[PDB]
Amino acid sequence: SAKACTRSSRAGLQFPVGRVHRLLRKGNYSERVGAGAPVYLAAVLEYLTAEILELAGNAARDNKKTRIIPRHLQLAIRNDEELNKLLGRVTIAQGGVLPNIQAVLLPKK
Amino acid sequence: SAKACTRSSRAGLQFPVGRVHRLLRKGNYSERVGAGAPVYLAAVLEYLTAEILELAGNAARDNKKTRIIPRHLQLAIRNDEELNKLLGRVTIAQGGVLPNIQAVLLPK
Amino acid sequence: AIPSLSECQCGICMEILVEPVTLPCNHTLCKPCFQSTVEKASLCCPFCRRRVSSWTRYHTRRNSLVNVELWTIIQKHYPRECKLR
Amino acid sequence: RSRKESYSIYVYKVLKQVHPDTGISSKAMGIMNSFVNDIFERIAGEASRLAHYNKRSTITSREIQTAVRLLLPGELAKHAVSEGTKAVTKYTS
Amino acid sequence: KRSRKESYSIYVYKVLKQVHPDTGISSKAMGIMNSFVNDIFERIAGEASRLAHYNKRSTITSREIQTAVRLLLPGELAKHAVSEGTKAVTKYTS
Amino acid sequence: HMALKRINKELSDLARDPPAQISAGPVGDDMFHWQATIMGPNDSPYQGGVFFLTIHFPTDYPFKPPKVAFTTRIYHPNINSNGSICLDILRSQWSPALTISKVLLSIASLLDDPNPDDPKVPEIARIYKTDRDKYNRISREWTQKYAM
Amino acid sequence: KVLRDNIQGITKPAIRRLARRGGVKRISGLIYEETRGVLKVFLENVIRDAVTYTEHAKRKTVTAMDVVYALKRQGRTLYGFGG
Amino acid sequence: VLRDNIQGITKPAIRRLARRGGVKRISGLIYEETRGVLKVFLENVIRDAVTYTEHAKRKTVTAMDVVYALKRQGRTLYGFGG
Amino acid sequence: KPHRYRPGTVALREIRRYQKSTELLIRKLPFQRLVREIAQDFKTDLRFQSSAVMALQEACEAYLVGLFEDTNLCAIHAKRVTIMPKDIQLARRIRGERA
Amino acid sequence: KPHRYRPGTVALREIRRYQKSTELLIRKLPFQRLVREIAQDFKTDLRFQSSAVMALQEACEAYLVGLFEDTNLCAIHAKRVTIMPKDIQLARRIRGERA
DNA sequence: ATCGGATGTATATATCTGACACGTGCCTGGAGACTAGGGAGTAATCCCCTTGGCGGTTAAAACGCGGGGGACAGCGCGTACGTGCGTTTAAGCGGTGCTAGAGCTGTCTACGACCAATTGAGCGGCCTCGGCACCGGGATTCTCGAT
DNA sequence: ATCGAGAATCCCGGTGCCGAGGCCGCTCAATTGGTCGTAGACAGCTCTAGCACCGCTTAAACGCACGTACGCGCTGTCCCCCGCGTTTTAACCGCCAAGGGGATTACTCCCTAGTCTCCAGGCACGTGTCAGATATATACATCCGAT
Ligand SMILES: [Zn+2]
Ligand SMILES: [Zn+2]
Hints:
CATH superfamily of chain D: Histone, subunit A
Bound molecules: zinc ion
Radius of gyration of chain A: 20 Å
Organism (chain G): Homo sapiens
GO molecular function (chain G): DNA binding; protein heterodimerization activity; RNA binding; structural constituent of chromatin
Largest interface: A-D, 59 and 59 residues
Structural class of chain D: mainly alpha
Oligomer: heterodecamer
Protein name (chain G): Histone H4
Strand content of chain A: 5-15%
Helix content of chain A: 40-55%
Family (chain G): Belongs to the histone H4 family.
Order of helices and strands of chain D: HEHEHH
Keywords (chain G): Acetylation, Chromosomal rearrangement, Chromosome, Citrullination, Disease variant, DNA-binding, Hydroxylation, Intellectual disability, Isopeptide bond, Methylation, Nucleosome core, Nucleus, Phosphoprotein, Ubl conjugation
């Protein structure tokens, strides 16, 4: 690239590359840290954030609301397949549960 | 304690203190490492090793042998309240399982 | 058969046994000496020199360390020395 | 006073990039911050373990890629690897 | 020749001869003991590292390892392990 | 405390049946500090050699071992120049059941034969395990010059 | 100023509501004592580690971060209270 | 190339595994379920083992890769190194 | 004459009411008192942040709900609809909590 | 006239025999072939160290043996002695492997 | 198959309040230029250990049959749980006052990292003998059909 | 309740073989000695928020009654696993042979850390307003008894 603007804009990201570089350097992970690791990690983090925010926004708009609340995040995470496996052991505060009822308990015809 | 003897003997331990100090310094745990941490860690490791080995030897003597095989280690670990909790997710190769048959299945 | 006063002497503090504990090696000694030994000595029988870590760990959770059968005998037969100290 | 850093502004920028007309509350923002921190810790720790297993002292982009492939499930891992490779390639020139 | 590979075999054998002065040990059992020692070392060291990072420190002291032992071991193993470590440190200092 | 009574009984027991060619006693007004004299064993190159030792009792006795140190100079792989003693009884395998008489007997047995497997001074240990006459000679002049 | 028998404040209707959220249509009469016992065990397990964390830091107040750390150490990550 | 090797996990082997597990009586549809679940477990472990091998620029799957893959899933194994 | 609901048609409605909400179901003061009582054994005279109690409550309620789901599945497995203590015991055993 | 053991009294003998040994209950060559076939999807022309196959075999057997205990407990909970695939499914769901 | 109460849930409108989105000052952390050195890339050699083939023998697998014990369905009972009503209880909210203790700043003293010299602990390679595996014969003990 | 016969398991004595434990040579990593920069231990001050108390609603809890449906036991049927015998298939063992790739060593070069200087991006603080919660009155889905 042009080697002129900020590193986040140089790589085309929104998440900070300098802050991620500092966190990797001062986090007691290794003696040295390469020059391309923060870019990769920031890209991965931004992709995951964009995915979850898209699903949560869809859930909120399906509920006639214009703000994402923890309930919408819980619905977006639980309904999806990969995001539920990635966050299997995670508890979302004020998120509730996904509504389902076992078919045995429904009234007989 | 008086100096002019090996570090692992001033503490009275058997596990090495210099090796543990080096493994803590180069293990990417923290920037600095205190002078008493290796001694404490080596003491804890030695205590746990002795704890396992005593019960393993008792089981070996029960089985009329003068040697310890993984079966004796499994028998020692599984039959203890705290050791089983500590090594709960751990699999020991060639250890087998404890004998336990549910009372429902026995003949009447 | 009943033990005498001479044969009821602790091997560490050389006093009358109080809250005695009997190790699996059939070696008995009073509770304060046992606790001081386990805290500062090598965590074995001071006489036999055998490992008693598992026994102490298993019997501490149930308060079954003391030897009540002989403790009552000592508390009843010889009130003088035990009450004095 | 002491200042506390957070990923709030970047999360808001991503949200406005995805859904331009939806806002976000405060508790949801805190949950997002916790999620980002957790994923950072997971990937960085696995990359450190990979570097230590091979007798290296540097965390390069390939170790981050291997950590991403080991942590995330199939399609998530594929898309994350693609995005990271694209970002690094665009950054290096 | 073949490169040197460190292990905890000598010290495990020394402890075994301390506790049972008439019992040997196999090779698979020795490998299992080595793996157990390595695993416990990693657990305690990692817990201490995280604990020191939480409080904004730069040094792993005996206090951090003591608290890690308190956290990781079960109810009655922790007390005896802490006692043994404190005794070892006290003996080493003086 | 308990240490004072234990040391008093120790002195009484030592007085009842003193061992062979060793004599220990309190230095003075306090029972904590002790001084002892040891004779070189007959089956050793320390014939007719008197040796002096100082004993310091930690206040937390018997649960902590006493510390003994040579006063005179001796030629032996298990004793350093300043009087340091390398013995498993004093540091490694000490149990509260032991007595000062027992540690003195252990020191006498150490004077009987050395332990070159784990020596305090490795050079004289290897020269001892290489030849016998050199060590016997030099120990003879050491006990003739300093012990006597 | 000690407290006693405060596990009876986890009343029967509260346990019934938790079961209804869980998806339970019918409940037996001995479920409540079992639920109280499980509740006590879980709370003791979490609070022991939380108090250990707050004691290592030379504090007399347990913070939200100590509880979060204890929960994460026990394998139940919590979002929304920091970390 | 190899195909249809899941049927080498015969009925007697599954019966022996059940007997060691403490099972007194077994139905007739257990074996296919066991084959399926074992295949899933093997795929899950071998995928991580091969990933570890490929990162190290190797062509031989060592025991260290298998041990690391098992430890990565909360299935620590003692006896083959580590 | 007066209206009576068939048994089970009011408990199938509370399920829909409580699976659509996110509120906490245990009263806060009794739970806070229970938390303060439990933490008396480990260290005397502690102080709790207002957020520590909330974190404990929101973790514990979620744990209880997750346990009750498995309990309901265990009860259904035995060809019943009500949940006994043995369902809770089996769920806890299989999960590995008590072993 | 020929001596025959009643059903169920030989299964218990096998239970007592196999819970006392420590060997591997799956034949080695079929398991090695299965491992190679499964691994051939991820990367071709792979080579396996002789102890990698052994580690995989030990892990797989220690997993199946531990699964069968939960399966048997589910079967007993359902008031039966015969284990069925639904027992395996319930055990896996409660453990967290199926969900 | 519905027919009509009776209940509860969903829908539309007004409103007002506190949390969300934006703007401003600034100060600390990130960017830019430069130098030094050690970590990692690449080429070359060695030899260990992985793959492939062959023959034999024999333990384990596959197939089949007889039947008995266990899984599944159907009935009946009575008791334990659900639904509804009226009464007592303590949570929830607001407001006030006090101070224990978390949080931040300034000094300085002891502890831990770096570096050079040195030598003994621990590793690799060898070798021997006793513990454990195996085989053959016998004693003891569950098991089952018949009384 | 028992007697006895066929089958399985444990005990005991003799033989052998290989791996467990001790020994020797040596190479490098742990120990000692000295120096220096800074981490955190301690004292002092601030001001946040955690705790305790008081009064008023009214929401949730509790106790009681009725009835009914579901848990549990019993009985019957049938069919599918189990135990045993005979035959077929391929696993296991010992052996030989080839070479693929893992593991070590030497040289080089360039990528990253440490340092100094500089400035703007993000954090704390303040403010305005509109999205959503609450209150109130219809509209319709749903359930239950009755022919
Ligand atoms: Zn005593
Ligand atoms: Zn004894």
